[PDB]
Design a protein around this ligand. Structure first.
Ligand SMILES: [Mg+2]
Ligand SMILES: [Mn+2]
Ligand SMILES: [Mn+2]
Length: 271
């Protein structure tokens, strides 16, 4: 079975429509799979605040997501989190690492999200998520994910300083052109798997651009990963950072593509 948890509280959001994009994604999954999501948190406007301000503002939402994710992970369902921002995972990844200390996290993102308070150029909490879960800095929500068990998938054009933090910590990076389903399967070895996706991993627009080599990952590559992870080894999936307004045609088209990508894994868990 699938347990759907949806964040609707601000967690450092700097984009206007990621809370709405999460809501629309959750609605599409509810309709397709016959689920009702557990919605957590109260919306608030986006702002360009420092992580040191945004993080305590998000405490209530993050604690409530932690509690819901803990309950889902303790059972025997596929835990699906539809999150406004990657920063929600500061609460979920420590739970995953505690409950499944052998799990590999596939952190699928166009960015590394591996900055610390000392290295961030923008102050953005969302750029500090994977490093916080791995304990390079203290988010107040725990850590415990071993960097040797974290794999960045689809990341590219990483700042040279952040890239060396990643390398020093032992986090592997599989860029889009190397991120075939088999390359990802080979990186997880015999471990159970947690998948975290930031949609900025995807190549922008043009749908299939037949004569251009993409810089990002294509939807078919994401779908292939979901097809390749065995259902009995998939712990959970987080879907984050769809910036699409409510009631827009854009959100309708985006969620259709999302449903296509996740279907292999979600269909198997529903069955
Ligand atoms: Mg390789
Ligand atoms: Mn991200
Ligand atoms: Mn990103």
């Amino acid at each position: 079975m699938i347990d759907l948890i949806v964040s609707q509280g601000r967690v450092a959001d700097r984009a206007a429509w990621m809370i709405e994009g999460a809501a629309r994604t959750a609605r599409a999954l509810e309709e397709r799979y016959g689920l009702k999501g557990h919605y957590v948190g109260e919306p608030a406007p986006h702002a360009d605040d420092d992580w040191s301000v945004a993080l305590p503002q998000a405490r209530e939402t993050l604690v409530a997501v932690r509690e819901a994710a803990t309950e889902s992970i303790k059972g025997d369902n596929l835990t699906v989190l539809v999150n406004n921002t990657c920063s929600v995972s500061l609460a979920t990844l420590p739970v995953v690492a505690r409950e499944h200390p052998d799990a590999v996290v596939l952190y699928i993102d166009g960015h590394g999200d591996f900055n610390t308070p000392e290295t961030t150029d923008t102050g953005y909490l969302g750029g500090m998520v994977l490093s916080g879960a791995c304990g390079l800095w203290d988010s107040g929500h725990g850590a415990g994910l071993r960097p040797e068990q974290a794999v960045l998938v689809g990341s590219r054009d990483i700042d040279e300083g952040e890239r060396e933090l990643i390398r020093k910590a032992g986090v592997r990076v599989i860029p889009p052109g190397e991120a075939t389903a088999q390359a990802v399967l080979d990186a997880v070895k015999d471990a159970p798997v947690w998948i975290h996706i930031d949609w900025d991993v995807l190549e922008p627009g043009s749908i299939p651009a037949d004569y251009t080599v993409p810089d990002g990952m294509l939807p078919a590559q994401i779908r292939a990963v979901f097809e390749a992870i065995p259902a009995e080894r998939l712990i959970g999936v987080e879907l984050a950072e769809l910036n699409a307004p409510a009631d827009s045609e854009r959100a309708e088209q985006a969620v259709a593509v999302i449903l296509d990508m996740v279907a292999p894994a979600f269909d198997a868990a529903a069955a």
